[PDB]
Copies of this chain bind each other. A is one copy, B any other.
């Protein structure tokens, strides 16, 4: 318990004499406006500040803001600038802290470099009362914990009009965004499960999967290794083909079109929603540009320029940034190589002959993810330092610029193994005659038995479950408690309670996870349905986890008022527009959908497909290995062996040309590229069409603000 103030202060009680020389000069400028009283307690002393009344409408009339009025037509109170209330207890704690903070920034000798220098350690508003606790006189924060930030309440709606009142429009605007995103994930998950279960129903009705699961063919493939791998039968790995038909179903194409159109209609819905939320709170968006002070090393450098009394260096460090992006790109694939090459050629030295091929893939991906989790912090640090070097003008430019430079890095290292698996996996190996030897010592890399699509789906699967759901939430809960143990192992007053809390670190690491997750929703659902489902399961946990992090474990933000999410809308629209071309390439060049359609329409010799797998397998002759690249010990799976088969669209060896590129390769390639053109153009046009149709401003808000303006006129004239 105490009396009723606004903003605290945290000095460091015992150079030092200049610390006290500035520590008693600033508040002398603070005497004229705000009545301060300093308190002396156990650990480190603090400074207290209570606002005085008659300067508060000086600041409330200094800036234009809307406050509640007395008149109400149609069951709803109007708002104008500042008049007609007269309560002396109607200024909420949030707005009081806003005004007091404006005085905290305005007067100079603000707290930018005064706080950033070392004399002051923390400047922050306090909260009313306490969550849970005992015998509390109806706290707002207790109410908010009891209705919003509990795991037991995840079905009831977001109380957005209260969280705006207690945290401000920025923090309120975030949870509104996450609410609309999770609400839009419901039909995505329903349609995802319907398409996947349509996949599950008709697995054993198709032709091309039966052709592999059939016995009595005795068809043999080439060993896919340099020295030590043997011949393998087609019907051996047939579960992977069964799951392949579970994933590259002809309903998934329709699901991809549905997802592009889904992302577009989500953009429309959210524009409309923040428009009505800009109605309900603050309508005149004309904040005065160049309002705050400049960034202090720009004033320092500017002072150096005035001592001396650059359009080369910003572009120079932008090129530095692009360099870092390029070797980030190659670094991801480097680390993926190291990961798949964690345990190579271990067939011999244990001599147990497991041949399980599971631990190499599983621990490859898991070790890979450990290196990505470890490296992400480094990239964040390079973003902060580089943006510090560039010397932006304001705080807004620092926030925006740092946001973009962090996003490119996390995009690159968080997505590049999936680009390597989905596209560039088994493209570049030659015929079984000659192999493409990278580094001139051994082979590049070979695909899975039965298609590289499985490695994409299980890699993508354990990223949607590994890093997103379990790892990130477990550290997101786990870190602040451990910082609490660190800060401990080295009747209580209010600010002494709030000092033990952790300081607040912006909204960028909390939007960031959601932009990357949105990238997982829209960029790779051409080859993997039911991804939204995983996004929804992560999302329900994320909203309440973040809410409990606000109410429980953090001190209060200072309630910066803004009217849109900002740069994140451009990032969402960019990613959602990039999704179309990458879905076209995933469908055509990966999904094995084009060769089946071409075989149905050009080499059928009947109505349907049969002998498709007979058609793809390019017969080879085992006499033509390059003196050592033969299988080292042939398995003798049957009596003998004469010819191995492989899938590359090449002519048989007995023809007058052997081991060249056939007609069918160019036919399939032409059909693939034609699909890319048609898909990209039609889906760009549809995704534009649902922008042109849906009204970007809502009607009810336009007519209601028009009626409010008219009634404001006819009420004002009297």
Contact = CB atoms under 8 A, between A and B. Distances in A.
Interface string A567-592: 00000000000000100000000000
Contacts of A195: none
A17 to B, nearest CB: 43
Contacts of A674: 673
A486 to B, nearest CB: 45
Interface stretch (A65-73, A311-319, A664-672): A664-672
Interface string A665-696: 01101100110110011000000000000000
Contacts of A667: 666
A401 to B, nearest CB: 15
A468 B637 CA distance: 79
Contact of A666 (B666, B676, B677, B680): B666
Contact of A673 (B581, B662, B670, B681): B670
Copies in the complex: 2
Contacts of A666: 663, 666-667, 669-670
A581 B663 contact: no
Contacts of A677: 673, 676-677, 680
Interface string A420-457: 00000000000000000000000000000000000000
A658 to B, nearest CB: 16
Interface in A460-517: none
Of A662, A663, A669, A670, most buried by chain B (CB within 10 Å of CB) is A670
Nearest to A663: B663
Contact of A670 (B662, B669, B680, B681): B669
A4 to B, nearest CB: 37
A623 B576 CA distance: 59
Contacts of A673: 670, 673-674, 676-677
A251 B673 CA distance: 26
A319 to B, nearest CB: 16
Nearest to A581: B681
A518 to B, nearest CB: 21
Nearest to A664: B666
Nearest to A673: B673
A290 to B, nearest CB: 9
A662 B677 CA distance: 24
A678 to B, nearest CB: 10
Contacts of A662: 663
A712 B426 CA distance: 70
Nearest to A675: B673
A391 B582 CA distance: 45
Contacts of A680: 677, 680
Contacts of A681: 581
A182 to B, nearest CB: 31
A360 B22 CA distance: 96
15 contacts: A581-B681, A662-B663, A663-B663, A663-B666, A666-B666, A666-B667, A666-B669, A666-B670, A670-B673, A673-B673, A673-B674, A673-B676, A673-B677, A677-B677, A680-B680
Given A663-B663, A677-B677, 16 more contacts: A581-B681, A662-B663, A663-B666, A666-B666, A666-B667, A666-B670, A669-B670, A670-B670, A670-B673, A673-B673, A673-B674, A673-B676, A673-B677, A676-B677, A677-B680, A680-B680
**Top 9 closest pairs, chain A to chain B, by CB:** A666-B666, A673-B673, A670-B670, A669-B670, A663-B663, A666-B667, A666-B670, A673-B674, A676-B677
